[PDB]
């Protein structure tokens, strides 16, 4: 009982600390030194901002789990749920946009000359935040606080019929956050790896082949982290929706662990995208 609560609290605390530290460190490196002079750095900045705002709502979940109720109020409940659902889609669509950017940079160079500019990257990022606002605003409306068994609960209330709109929201979030992003990232990076294999520069030398292995390994690490992190929470939500399961301590541990993995991807993406990047590595070596 107590051991489980301490374990869950420690897990959420470690995930929140690592995520906030990584996000603010990446944003500080981008703003103070890089000055956002390149489109890729703009995408990394938007990704870090989205991950920071998504990770910021996690101590509210910690307080909700510890106290068993929501004492903050209805307005802050709306704000926190809206920021969570907003920045999850913002982070995922920023990942998809960076995948499309790398695909265009590799496979279609002449089109990448027009495509890869600061102005176009700013336009596509503004479109990404607006498309995230599309899902964010009605969630901000629907979210309220309900009095259940003497406890305030911070949750989404759906208009009648509740089951139809609730499961429609679950299906839409599942499809647009899992089915389309995994397919876009997988197809774009697969065709990217095939084109890189087609390139003559990368082949024909031992060190250059080792560099090609490094790039392929980095791509597979990114895709594997994305799939392995987002897959269990989505499958678990689908199973919980379809099949009612009896309340067990193992169920609570599995639920919180899957949520922790989902936020863990938003914590570990700045490490992969920023620190392993060559330009930021040169910035750390120079400074």
């Amino acid at each position: 009982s107590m051991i489980t609560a301490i374990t869950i609290m420690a897990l959420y605390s470690i995930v929140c600390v690592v995520g906030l530290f990584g996000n603010f460190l990446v944003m500080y490196v981008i703003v103070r030194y890089t000055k956002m002079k390149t489109a890729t750095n703009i995408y990394i900045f938007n990704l870090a901002l989205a991950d920071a705002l998504a990770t910021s709502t996690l101590p509210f979940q910690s307080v909700n789990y510890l106290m068993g109720t929501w004492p903050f109020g209805t307005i802050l409940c709306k704000i926190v749920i809206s920021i969570d659902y907003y920045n999850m889609f913002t982070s995922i669509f920023t990942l998809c946009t960076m995948s499309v950017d790398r695909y265009i940079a590799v496979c279609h160079p002449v089109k990448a000359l027009d495509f890869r500019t600061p102005r176009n990257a700013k336009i596509i990022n503004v479109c990404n935040w607006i498309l995230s606002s599309a899902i964010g605003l009605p969630v901000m409306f629907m979210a309220t606080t309900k009095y259940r068994q003497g406890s305030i609960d911070c949750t989404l209330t759906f208009s009648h019929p509740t089951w139809y709109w609730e499961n429609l929201l679950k299906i839409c979030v599942f499809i647009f956050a899992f089915i389309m992003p995994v397919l876009i990232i997988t197809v774009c990076y697969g065709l990217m790896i095939l084109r890189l294999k087609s390139v003559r520069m990368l082949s024909g030398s031992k060190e250059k082949d080792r560099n090609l292995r490094r790039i392929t390994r980095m791509v597979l690490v990114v895709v594997a982290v994305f799939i392995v992190c987002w897959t269990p929470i989505h499958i678990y939500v689908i199973i919980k929706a379809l099949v009612t399961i009896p309340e067990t301590t193992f169920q609570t541990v599995s639920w919180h662990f899957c949520i922790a993995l989902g936020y863990t991807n938003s914590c570990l993406n700045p490490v992969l995208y920023a620190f392993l990047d060559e330009n930021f590595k040169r910035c750390f070596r120079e400074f």
Binding site: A105, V106, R116, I215, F280
Partner: peptide, 23 residues
Amino acid sequence: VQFVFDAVTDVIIKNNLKDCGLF
């Protein structure tokens, strides 16, 4: 001009990968 275009294409691919930072 095909060889020159292929070499320029390879240089632009290298520059795009360097700008992204995969190299």
